[model samples]
Target chain A: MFEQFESKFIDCDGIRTHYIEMGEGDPLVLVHGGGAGADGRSNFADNFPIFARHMRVIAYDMVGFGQTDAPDPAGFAYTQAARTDHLISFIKALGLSKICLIGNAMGGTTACGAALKAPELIDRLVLMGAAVNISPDDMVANRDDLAAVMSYDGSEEGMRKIIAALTHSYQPTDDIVHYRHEASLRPTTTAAYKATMGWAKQNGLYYSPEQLASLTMPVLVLGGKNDVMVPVRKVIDQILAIPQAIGHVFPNCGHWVMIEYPEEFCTQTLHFFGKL
Target chain B: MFEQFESKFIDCDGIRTHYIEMGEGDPLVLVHGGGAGADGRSNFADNFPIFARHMRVIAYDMVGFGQTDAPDPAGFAYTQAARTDHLISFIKALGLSKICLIGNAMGGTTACGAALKAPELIDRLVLMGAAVNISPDDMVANRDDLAAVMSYDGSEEGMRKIIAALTHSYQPTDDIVHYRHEASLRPTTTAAYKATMGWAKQNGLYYSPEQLASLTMPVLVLGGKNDVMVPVRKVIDQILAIPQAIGHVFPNCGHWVMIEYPEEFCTQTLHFFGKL
Candidate 1:
């Protein structure tokens, strides 16, 4: 994943933002999801080579994730708004405009907030299993795999359980599991993740109905067929909330769609961003 | 309201279906919503003239409302499924093919159902205040005007409140209220409505997320800023659920969009349907 791409950093709002840059065409940014050890590489390692063939791909680790600096929790809020603010500054700091964004889970939430707030900067948006605007209580009631994900303690067993919850049938590679488990053990990772959850719990999740309905740019929403963390049902509802959104539910897929079905995701994402 | 158009009756499922037919090009059907005196004429009286300019405009009174013959409550089930069944037969009986449909309110739900079930027969679909797959709990919390609509008492006051809830600013004329009151008092209207509510309560509302995503025709979802019965928030979501759907939100309008701002509605609708 790191061999072909140039990994670099830039100061966004005084926070070091780690990003991978590759290829050349319309600028397309990839935002990774949230969870213990979640980083751009773990999320998009297989994606860029395909996406980069047609467009310039930029994938980043938000503050507190990946190699990105985990700022003192005393000063950072760790909410989607915080990530959105940094993403905005990241785009501005890099002098990128008319950019298309591909985001998954937490990244999706941050990118959607940015796109809705700064429509002029975004050409198109793709929310892949975006965990924005979902009612938290829904999983509590409907998801059978809920306990495995919620009870994660960053142990090998916990990582195993989380991995099991994420895919429909495909087993996660041993290296991928080890990477996430080790990443979660970083004391800063635990501290930052804890603060992030607290901030989200306090501020609530995603946008208001009014805010969501006001989104006007062309959007593509993707859902995994067997995803338990963010069920396809919620994905469908999320799609319905935006005025200019279309949805695709991939069969035999789950929370890790980008990694699980890289080719299809890249193909669809490239085509949607290029259209209109 | 219907003086300019000749009215005719066709037998559909042993029910004498009343419809108004005019113009000649593409077979464009207008399905009126549910309300007292919510005949095709009242809903689209001010609409057909403009729409007829380009296509064969046929506005019909659905079963259980208007002048259409209502079956015995003993055997009737006035759910969306029932309305969908009749609408399919209506289209088939008329020898209409590749037909375009424009639906308002409950009519929108009916059209969405029909489109999903018989994709080949439907060309394009327009849903105004289309209420489908909405969690019933949402209505309890946000729709201040829900009770006024669900508990119709066949009184002038009830009709007045319903009409008021329907529009943003346009006043309901005395004649219109009186007409609705008179229609509601029709013995069959009362029986049909009773069965309709019963069927709805038993079956719940709208399409499932999978069914909605499965819909493949070109769809245009419209919402009114002031529509309390079906919020523009939900309207935007409905558009998001469909793959080939786009949306329009009318300002300073409400549930009675077909009547409140007939000109703008018709103009946009015709241009959208006419566009390739």
Candidate 2:
């Protein structure tokens, strides 16, 4: 399934970055959400074949995820702002002037933040099961999901359990799960998890819903009724706030929309991008 | 029923503002939504007596609505910003330091925007069937309701139809409808209707979802599941985006939550205000 893509690396703001790429056309950058052992490849693996067939699809591991070099947790901001800056740098380093941004969870927050900061750099935006404008109560509601992700011990069974917790139920192959398990055991990966929660205890990754109002670029907001971590109402909130955004909520799907309904997700996104 | 309240007038940025007052405590200002003849009294008449029991309640006719003097619609701006400014002036003229804002429809937009502009002036916020983060599409979705509002011919039957459009068959008495018919024929009311539709066509009453993100004040957002003008999802959208905000949606109601469920609306609002 992964044979068509090439694994690559880039120096993003003096940090080594790991990524996977396929095809060549208008760029469509896929951003993975956060969870136990989550990375772009692990997140987009099932859908890459479909997307890459039509465009220059790139999915990269953000700093502190997968093989990307993680700055020391002690000094790094370990916040969404820091992640947003890194994403902007990644795009700049690649010399891509404009690209479509597709993100989930914190990745969605980064994409929104990026678009807010530099709308010129973004061509189109797609948010899938992304979380933003989160209330304190929502944070409390997300505790079970967070606990599941935080408690992973980097074993195959642990990875399986975390993936189960992410969606209503969509499992990768045994080979894929094992690969993810090994990736999570890396020293930097463990450090990334520590830094994320430590920063959360002090302050949340705050994004003003007002900031989303400036997003005039064409946006496709995807949501799921089964998504407990990122409520459909939050998705509705994002769509209403954005000027040029339309949203569709998929029934029976959870936070991992792409994984849960890869074909439908890709088709809807392509239609929105005006390619289908 | 409204005999206990006294009608008063004051200058609000040169517009002669008409209002009714009851009780004595911290101020609770009611701003009504847009329609053929929507005034604070019309919107909150049933609500006033109940809220007045607990607070220094004031319900006022905005410029171009009811007995309020409508300045030249050409120069009045006729936007939510204009309405917000009028409200700010009204509060200042009354020499009030702090007040709660309760608004419905465009009134909700005004209250929320006022809260955004002057958080210090607002102690609490209650939004009933309010519309915000309005899109061109929402304006389109609201077209039926908008057309019903704008096409009113100042007949008692017309007034009844408009009121019927606002709620789910909470029939107004012939006298009540006749009173509304007379109110709509006023020069001020006619100007308001033209200005509202004209402004909507030209530039719309635009408020970003981000704007609501800043409202940390205790807020109660009320909605109707039967609402066709403002989707219940949009109501949910506001609640999730506004921190410190809670929401309730009444079944078997429409855009007129107060009229459809007046007792429940007041009870829930008071409950939210911690009076119950």
Candidate 3:
């Protein structure tokens, strides 16, 4: 299932980043969410081939997650800012410009930050169940589900719980669960995940309204109406704040909109990116 | 346009209530929003014929608006509780049992209250851009639009501003604006609207988590993604809190879902009510 695309590495500003590249057309970068065992492949394996058929697809592991080199938190901070900087560097390292970015969950947060920081490099943006740094305290529903993600342990049970919290109807296959569980338990991934959580305690994902308002690129904000992590209202707020933005909420879906409604997601993505 | 449906009056607890009934089969009551000149016909005239094709559709004016008797606030109160009581009484006066209730904006708020107060009467609930009494302090987007609605003056310009705030794509015809403006300026309507606003200042629409959680009837919570008066997030919160609930947010729509997307709204409403 995963043999078509070759696993590759790029030296992004001194850090060795792991990613998979395939297809041939305009560049479409896939940024996976931040959770235990979350990698580019794990988060976006299903949609990669479909997107690849239409565009040059690059799905990469972020810092401290998957195969990406997670430097010790002491010297290199595992903050959102760090991740955004790394994403920019990765793009520059690959000599790619004016690329479309598709990110889910924490990856969406990173994508938003990157697009904000370097709008010239981005053609369009898609944030799927993305965590924007806006205040989320007003969301009164799905706190328990969000808490489940925040308190995820390294156990297989914990991983399953996290998956359940992120999804609505789709059940996780055994292979996917074991794979994510194993990846989460990796020493580097575990340490970086904890440090990322630590830094996030005081400084949550923080893109100000002004920063969002300044975004000029076309943005498609997608979320599950049932997404507890990033409520639909928050998604609407993000859409309304951004000047050139459109929003869609999938009914009965949780955090994983791409995975839950892959066909609809791909179709909408293609239409938004002007491919169809 | 409305001549096809004969205007009728009913004695509800001695208050002369105005309503329009058409079609046949299971009873489906349409409750209009609360505002100056907002009668059942004004709010839902466009949707009445379409909905009437399938079931016994009843669109009625509540206490303070439309042709319904607006007893002075000194005696009538013009509060949410009063509106809910009036709705329940209207149902009883009509001798309709186990009915499907559809409400929009202020009417949605009333529908939820009536369902909570008398669950035995309501079979299914459709709250379209409904105002649930949940605290809305945290919705950071669209405050200005909401403020415009709160401070609506009787001027035609003010009416247009309010309409703009409530809708996205659909433009209100001059006839609608003139009709609504004229209706809003009716002596009884003016007094009731002011009294309702005064009551709302201190007591915003409210329903407890427990009350929402205890709802045994099926609920379909619909909202316009661009709705400023009732944010999409609040709609999501209301959906998640209710025991048996589903939600849909229409893209680019404002406060009036049924008015903006009449065909889609009717289709979804019929489907939700087990009509289609």
- Model 1: lDDT of residue B45: 78
**What is candidate 1's lDDT per residue for B1-276, written digit by digit as tens?**
457778899988787899998788888999988766678887887888887788899999899988898888888767788899889989988988898898887788888889988888998998889878555676556546676766677777988988888888988778877877888888998889877755554454578777888887777777785678888667766755775565556656788787987876876577568632
Model 3: per-residue Cα lDDT at residue A24:
90
lDDT of 2 by residue, B72-185 (tens): 776766776787888888888898866878888778878888888888888888887787766776777667766776556667677777787778768787766766777778
True contacts kept of 2: 0.03
Per-candidate DockQ values are 0.04, 0.03, 0.11
lDDT of every model, 2 decimals: 0.78, 0.76, 0.82
lDDT of 1 at A105: 77
What are the interface RMSDs of all the models? 9.2, 10.6, 4.5
What is the lDDT, from 0 to 100, of the residue B225 in candidate 2? 62
Select the stronger candidate by DockQ from 1 and 2: 1
Which of candidates 1 and 3 reaches a greater DockQ?
A: 3
In terms of DockQ, the best-performing candidate is 3
Instruction: Write candidate 3's Cα lDDT for A134-201 as tens digits.
Output: 34443223446665566576789998889988888889999999989888888887888989866664
- The number of the candidate with the highest lDDT is 3
How far does residue B160 in candidate 1 sit from its true spot (Å)?
A: 32
* Native contact fraction, candidates in order: 0.00, 0.03, 0.10
Chain A, model 1: TM = 0.92
* Candidate 3 local lDDT, B151-221, one digit each (tens): 66888998888888888877889988898889888888788898886676556766778887887788888
